[PDB]
Amino acid sequence: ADKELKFLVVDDFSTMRRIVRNLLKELGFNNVEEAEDGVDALNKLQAGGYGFVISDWRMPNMDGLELLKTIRADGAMSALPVLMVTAEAKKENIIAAAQAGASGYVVKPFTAATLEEKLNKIFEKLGM
Ligand code: BEF
Ligand SMILES: [Mn+2]
């Protein structure tokens, strides 16, 4: 995938944002921004330029499902790759996020390899 692709990592806890950010760096992605919740993420997305979004689920103000539904419902970013990286592991949740339009879904804790696979799987599905 184009290494200049701009990523937006969303999670209410920095620890996870730092993990995702550093992993993207390893894969060759340095154009990466962060966000602490759904609202904060929509704001930055509003500032245009993003081509991929990795997001957590449980977050205050606006959670990950709501954020995914928002992105998908907006014609200016409806096809925006959204990879869910959450600790929510119940199948009723994986179904909800998948049905809402999730590009992928990874459960915490995850390995470096798992993230790369799931990311490459997205790039492959969308021809990136
Ligand atoms: F709070 Be996240 F869903 F890990
Ligand atoms: Mn969280």
Swiss-Prot record:
Cofactor (UniProt): Mg(2+)
GO MF annotation list: metal ion binding
Keywords, alphabetical: Acetylation, Chemotaxis, Cytoplasm, Flagellar rotation, Magnesium, Metal-binding, Phosphoprotein, Two-component regulatory system
PROSITE patterns according to UniProt: RESPONSE_REGULATORY
Xref: InterPro entries: CheY-like_superfamily, Sig_transdc_resp-reg_receiver, ST_Response_Regulator
Predominant subcellular localization, coarse grouping: cytoplasm
Gene Ontology BP annotations: archaeal or bacterial-type flagellum-dependent cell motility; chemotaxis; phosphorelay signal transduction system
PTM annotation: Phosphorylated by CheA or acetylated by acetyl-CoA synthetase, depending on which acetate metabolism pathway is available.
Cofactor binding: number and manner: Binds 1 Mg(2+) ion per subunit.
Record-linked Pfam families: Response_reg
Annotated ranges, domain Response regulatory: 6-123
Residues reported in the UniProt entry to bind Mg(2+): 11-12, 56, 58
Known function: Involved in the transmission of sensory signals from the chemoreceptors to the flagellar motors. In its active (phosphorylated or acetylated) form, CheY exhibits enhanced binding to a switch component, FliM, at the flagellar motor which induces a change from counterclockwise to clockwise flagellar rotation.
Protein name per its UniProtKB record: Chemotaxis protein CheY
Organism this protein belongs to: Shigella flexneri
